[PDB]
């Protein structure tokens, strides 16, 4: 029913610097009795969500004082005066004015580091897999930052979507970079119908895409 | 201190049934509404069901996606709330939280529900072989259930390793693992990925050959 829209989907923060995240509701969260039932939850990886803020701006017991909520009607903001390491994770706004209770898709607070272009590697199907009747083509986009990246497959110079699955790592513990795998799964028969296989990465670190290719017949 | 502890999660086939239970303590249970919320990657956090207090004659409410398939109930004498889930589907997969969101907020640890047709299946492990650094990989394809563990030269190479989260195709998991080594160490010295799938009692050591 009530749609909750959170902006940014990811915010990059420096420990010691402030953070601000936005929540917008598809209709007013002002209730008949004058109250506005907007809540903020926080979730650490592997942990249950925990409410920080209720009734727009009221802090839960034991919630640090660096957290402030504000807004009215359809526009709300969560702010952190100075980010600490414990604050990294996902923040959800939650609407309790209109039945059903409804959630934003969340805002991930991630640690800022220096921009880094991905290391791109492409791999042909193994002889083992081909023996088995399958043909997976694998592209790694490794150790890049910021998280946002575009991967394109090209078979004989022409784009390909069908059979592609992508997986991202979490921000690296030591590096603070991200990595992504792209996997094109073909039949042996289909793989043998084409010779040129290309993985292309576009990242903000260059206007020029990183192109990696092999030939089936080398 | 408010404590909610859920149980009853597990693996079930589509069409199957599961009952979640939540033992509550640290508040006057009789007087509280209780709410179930679930979490999945694809749908995020979703309200599932509400059961109201003795005053509202234990009035029950359901998300549209769940109406006619789920039943929320309560035992006021045992401070327990339940969720009977029938005709389960793949999209019901996720972490289920018992919550108190009545005049306060408290979330349980959660219980994981997995709705899948899949049988135990060991992985096929495939080598990924091609500056001053070289990247190698292992493709770990077509296994069930989670997890697999991947190490490189039995964990001696841990520094330049990325194992990516598994994805599903046709009920089976696939992932890949990358490792980055100085070009002085490979092809000259051997690099092997060690893949363990505990549920199939499977070990594969795949040496990466140029």
């Amino acid at each position: 029913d009530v749609v909750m829209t959170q902006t940014p989907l990811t915010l990059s923060v420096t420990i010691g610097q402030p953070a601000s995240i936005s929540c917008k509701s598809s209709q007013s969260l002002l209730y008949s009795n004058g109250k506005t039932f907007l809540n903020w939850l926080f979730q650490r990886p592997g942990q249950s969500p925990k409410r920080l803020i209720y009734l727009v701006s009221k802090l839960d017991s034991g919630v640090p004082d660096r957290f402030t909520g504000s807004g009215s009607g359809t526009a709300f903001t969560l702010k952190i005066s100075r980010v600490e390491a414990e604050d990294l994770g996902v923040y959800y706004c939650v609407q309790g004015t209109h039945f059903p209770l409804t959630f934003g898709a969340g805002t991930k607070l991630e640690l800022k580091r220096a921009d880094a272009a991905p290391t791109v590697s492409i791999f042909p199907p193994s002889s083992e897999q081909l023996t088995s009747g399958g043909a997976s083509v694998v592209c790694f986009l490794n150790n890049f930052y910021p998280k946002d990246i575009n991967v394109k497959w090209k078979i004989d110079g022409s784009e390909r979507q069908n059979g592609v699955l992508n997986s991202w790592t979490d921000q690296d513990s030591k590096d603070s970079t991200y990595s992504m795998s792209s996997t094109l799964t073909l039949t042996k028969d289909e793989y043998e119908r084409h010779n040129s296989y290309t993985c292309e990465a576009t990242h903000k670190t260059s206007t020029s895409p990183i192109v990696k290719s092999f030939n089936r017949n080398e | 201190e408010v404590k909610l502890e859920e149980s009853g999660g597990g693996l079930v086939q589509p069409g199957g049934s599961m009952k979640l239970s939540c033992a509550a303590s640290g508040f006057t249970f009789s007087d509280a509404y209780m709410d179930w919320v679930r979490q999945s990657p694809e749908k995020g956090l979703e309200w599932v069901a509400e059961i109201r207090n003795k005053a509202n004659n234990h009035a029950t409410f359901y998300a549209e996606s769940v109406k006619g398939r789920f039943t929320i109930s309560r035992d006021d004498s045992k401070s327990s709330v339940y969720l009977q889930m029938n005709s389960l589907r793949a999209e019901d997969t996720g972490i289920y939280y018992c919550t108190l969101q009545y005049g306060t907020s408290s979330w349980g640890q959660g219980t994981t529900l997995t709705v899948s047709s899949a049988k135990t299946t060991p992985p096929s492990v495939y080598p990924l072989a091609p500056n001053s650094m070289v990247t190698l990989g292992c493709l770990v394809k077509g296994y069930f259930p989670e997890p697999v563990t991947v190490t490189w030269n039995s964990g001696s190479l841990s520094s330049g390793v990325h194992t990516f989260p598994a994805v599903l195709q046709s009920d089976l998991y696939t992932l890949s693992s990358s490792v980055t080594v100085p070009s002085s160490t490979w092809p000259s010295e051997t690099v092997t990925c060690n893949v363990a799938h505990p549920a199939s009692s499977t070990k594969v050591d795949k040496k990466i050959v140029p």
Partner: peptide, 8 residues
């Protein structure tokens, strides 16, 4: 005390 929703 500290309600999440309006239907309490």
């Amino acid at each position: 005390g500290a309600p999440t929703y309006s239907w309490g």
